[PDB]
Design a protein around this nucleic acid. Structure first.
Ligand SMILES: [Mg+2]
Ligand SMILES: [Mg+2]
Ligand SMILES: [Mg+2]
Ligand SMILES: [Mg+2]
Ligand SMILES: [Mg+2]
Ligand SMILES: [Mg+2]
Ligand SMILES: [Mg+2]
Lengths: 135, 132, 303, 220
RNA sequence: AUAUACCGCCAUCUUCAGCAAACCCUGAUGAAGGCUACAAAGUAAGCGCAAGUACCCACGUAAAGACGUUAGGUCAAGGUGUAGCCC
């Protein structure tokens, strides 16, 4: 006669309490496994709410420093003609190659953003990349 | 709404035999006749006398085997022999069944001036065709 | 249950031997037809409904197919789709879908069984929409270039779905003819049409223009012969009984057409059938009903 | 009987990973299967925030570290139940993967319900199936949402009937009542295939280990 | 006398298809409600419809037509509760 009050406690708590009370004569098959290796959270029903005032979801947008370089690249040269192949885990786009070259040039000790951009463009041209500016 | 010889539906706790379970329009389609005689054939006579005898026999048997008949009688007429096939219950004692069989045979024979036989078929309890 | 059905089968075998002994026939070669005949003789019932009549059949035919318990002693069900509650139906759907996936990867004789037939096969209760879904899936399978490997399966769900020319007889004088009959309303007509003749039509021993002084009836007599372009080519002797003049004319027309079918070609016979010259008019007088003036006329309503 | 149970049922409960489920996967495998992709930030569910790494251009990213821990726990639970010979029922209303999940269930010897979940399959089980029917000992949701983006009613019914539920919860799901939630991507075929393969492997390992331990005990 | 106590036999919607016990679920465990087939909580014995049957077919007409509505009709078919008369 397992309690059917899924809103009152968790299945583990209800089963345990009924066994203690004597309503359940035998522990259900899963009780020992649960008690041995419980989940990281006890599954207790919680009614969801909608945030109303100044409360906001704690999810933070995933940004990286190279995102600035990527945005500048896409604004200056566009997507390009080399279509992304997202199946390959090691795929590198023209933008990613530009980002790597920009990063190493910065490591060399250059601070000017526009100079880094133009130098990276010329370096990629030397390497043999057809960086077609959109404008 | 038609009411003739229909056992109206219930909560499903009412046991009914094959005869009761079937409405009048099932006679000759799913249930036969409880009295077989030549009175009602074309060109035959004494239908009224046969009907009156049948009614009296049914009442007399009902009152003579009280709480024993498990289903309606069957009255068969062959020549002048009258055979009453009665389904009964296995509650009354066999001594009383035999006493009443002999009694009914003799009394009906003398009353209707014809050889009367009474064939009892015993059942433990009323046969339930369905639960209405 | 299974033990109950086994006991019933033993009872049936013993009773079949007993019935064979009763009727004097050989117990070994006693068939179900013989059993049915013997029971019909021994327990004559005039009940119109055949099912209500006495029956001594095999327990397999008598008792409905009972679904066996679907789990073992340990409690574990047998079919992995058990908890769907429609394990058989969904197993069939799953198999059909697998066949369709394999087909997609690689690349007036029958009908579809009714929902009742599918339910009988699956020993489960289905719904109209479930049946329609399954039939749509099977139709997709049929269209998808189903080969022998698939057609063998599909056919498990397929169910299979002209005038009768009379023989030409010969009279004593060697003349060929054909005899037929036709009924219209209460009129029944027997017509004999000879292969060769001068168009004479003798009805009840009387010439047709005398028997049927009505132009409409003479036209009805004409209609079959005129249709097949055989006016004046055949002699006819008809005997019609019952009904009025028009019913008699229609019955004779049907009988004459049926008789002439023996002398016209098959294409002409089919053309007559399409023209309606060989169909027995089922329109008959409708019985009067109690509480109303006629078959359909109702008593004047009094608001 | 006493010693048999003590050494069969309770022996594996003394080990952190008796069936060695951690080897069945790695964070890299989950990433390659794209377990880390959630829905748009607008579809996000309030209770799935703790498992969301962040939001990459309005697209949620599920923390595969938490996914690895939760998946370890869920696989260990499933393995232990299969070892104990409980009934494992796979539920999923994703018609794209109905066939796959049914095949996985048949192959691993467990049960599946990928069809329209009729009302009362679990709460009305005794009437629907029979008074002696045995309800599933564990329910594994490959898609905790039905086909109208609401939680599968089986989740609520399993909680009612006290049947533990493993469940893959996307960023728009409600893990509150799922006993063992596994935050992950339930919409990519790669992710669904990885989940099916993992559960199949864990259950088969558990069953074969149960047979091996029984043979070892009964031969001595 | 009482059809406004009834059995019995029926009219009526019905030229309908629904009535449904026993369970399950939802509503915060209120009266109440319970469906979407690319399905979203309903399952349902039983009754009815349907089917089967009569007439001339598998059509048509009969028959059938549940649960309820009109305290619908009938105490004057008969029986019967209550009440009333017994020179
Ligand atoms: Mg009427
Ligand atoms: Mg999803
Ligand atoms: Mg009244
Ligand atoms: Mg009528
Ligand atoms: Mg009908
Ligand atoms: Mg009144
Ligand atoms: Mg009145």
């Amino acid at each position: 006669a397992g309690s059917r009050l899924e809103t009152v406690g968790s299945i583990f708590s209800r089963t345990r309490d009924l066994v203690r009370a004597g309503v359940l004569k035998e522990k259900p098959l899963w009780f020992d496994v649960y008690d041995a290796f419980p989940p990281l959270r006890e599954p207790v029903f919680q009614r969801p709410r909608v945030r109303y005032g100044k409360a906001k979801a704690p999810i933070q947008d995933i940004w990286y420093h190279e995102d600035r370089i990527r945005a500048k690249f896409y604004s200056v040269y566009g997507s390009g003609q080399r279509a992304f192949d997202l199946f390959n885990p090691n795929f590198k786009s023209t933008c990613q190659r530009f980002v790597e070259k920009y990063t190493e040039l910065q490591k060399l000790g250059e601070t000017d953003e526009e100079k880094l951009f133009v130098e990276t463009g010329k370096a990629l041209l030397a390497e043999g990349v057809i960086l077609r500016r959109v404008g | 709404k038609n009411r003739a010889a229909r056992v109206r539906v219930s909560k499903g706790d009412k046991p009914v035999t094959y005869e009761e379970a079937h409405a009048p329009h099932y006679i000759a389609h799913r249930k036969g006749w409880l009295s077989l005689h030549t009175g009602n054939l074309d060109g035959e006579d004494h239908a009224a006398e046969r009907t009156v005898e049948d009614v009296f026999l049914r009442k007399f048997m009902w009152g003579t085997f009280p709480g024993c008949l498990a289903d309606q009688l069957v009255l068969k007429r062959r020549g002048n022999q009258l055979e009453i096939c009665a389904v009964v219950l296995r509650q009354l004692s066999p001594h009383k069944y035999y006493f009443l069989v002999g009694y009914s045979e003799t009394l009906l024979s003398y009353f209707y001036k014809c050889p009367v036989r009474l064939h009892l078929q015993t059942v433990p309890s009323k046969v339930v065709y369905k639960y209405l | 249950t299974e033990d109950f059905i086994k006991k019933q089968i033993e009872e049936f075998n013993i009773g079949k031997r007993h019935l064979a002994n009763m009727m004097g026939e050989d117990p070994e070669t006693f068939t179900q037809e013989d059993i049915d005949r013997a029971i019909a003789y021994l327990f004559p019932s005039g009940l119109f409904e055949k099912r209500a009549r006495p029956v001594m059949k095999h327990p397999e035919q008598i008792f409905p197919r009972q679904r066996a318990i679907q789990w073992g002693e340990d409690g574990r069900p047998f079919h992995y789709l058990f908890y769907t509650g429609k394990q058989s139906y969904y197993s069939l759907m799953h198999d059909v879908y697998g066949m369709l996936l394999n087909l997609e990867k690689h690349q007036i004789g029958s009908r579809w069984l009714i929902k009742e037939e599918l339910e009988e096969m699956l020993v489960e209760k289905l719904s109209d929409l479930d049946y329609m879904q399954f039939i749509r899936l099977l139709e997709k399978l049929l269209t998808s270039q189903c080969g022998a490997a698939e057609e063998e399966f599909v056919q498990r769900f397929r169910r299979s779905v002209k005038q009768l020319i009379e023989p030409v007889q010969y009279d004593e004088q060697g003349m060929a003819f054909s005899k037929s009959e036709g009924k219209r309303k209460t009129a029944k007509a027997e017509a004999i049409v000879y292969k060769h003749g001068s168009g004479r039509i003798k009805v009840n021993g009387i010439d047709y223009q005398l028997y049927f002084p009505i132009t409409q009836d003479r036209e009805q007599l004409m209609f079959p012969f005129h249709f097949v372009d055989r006016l004046g080519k055949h002699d006819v002797t008809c005997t019609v009984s019952g009904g009025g003049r028009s019913a008699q004319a229609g019955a004779i027309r049907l009988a004459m057409a049926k008789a002439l079918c023996s002398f016209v070609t098959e294409d002409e016979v089919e053309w007559m059938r399409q023209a309606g010259l060989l169909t027995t008019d089922p329109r008959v007088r409708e019985r009067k009903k109690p509480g109303q003036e006629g078959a359909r006329r109702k008593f004047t309503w009094k608001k | 009987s006493t010693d048999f149970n003590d050494k069969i049922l309770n022996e594996p409960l003394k080990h952190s990973d008796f069936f060695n489920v951690k080897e069945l996967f790695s964070v890299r495998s989950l990433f390659d299967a794209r377990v880390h992709l959630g829905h748009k930030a607008g579809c996000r569910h309030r209770f799935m925030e703790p498992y969301i790494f962040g939001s990459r251009l309005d697209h949620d990213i599920i923390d595969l570290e938490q996914t690895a821990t939760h998946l370890q726990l869920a696989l260990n639970f499933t393995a232990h139940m299969a070892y104990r010979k409980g009934i494992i029922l796979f539920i999923s209303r994703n018609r794209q993967f109905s066939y796959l999940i049914e095949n996985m269930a048949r192959d691993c010897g467990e049960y599946a319900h990928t069809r329209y979940f009729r009302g009362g399959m679990l709460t009305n089980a005794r009437l629907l199936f029979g008074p002696t029917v045995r309800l599933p000992d564990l329910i594994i949701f490959l898609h905790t949402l039905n086909n109208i983006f609401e939680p599968h009613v089986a989740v609520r019914d399993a909680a009612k009937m006290n049947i533990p539920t493993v469940g893959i919860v996307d960023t728009n799901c409600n893990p509150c009542l799922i006993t063992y939630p596994v935050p992950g991507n339930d919409d990519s075929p790669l992710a669904v295939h990885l989940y099916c393969r993992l559960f199949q492997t864990a259950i088969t390992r558990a069953k074969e280990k149960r047979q091996q331990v029984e043979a070892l005990y009964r031969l001595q």
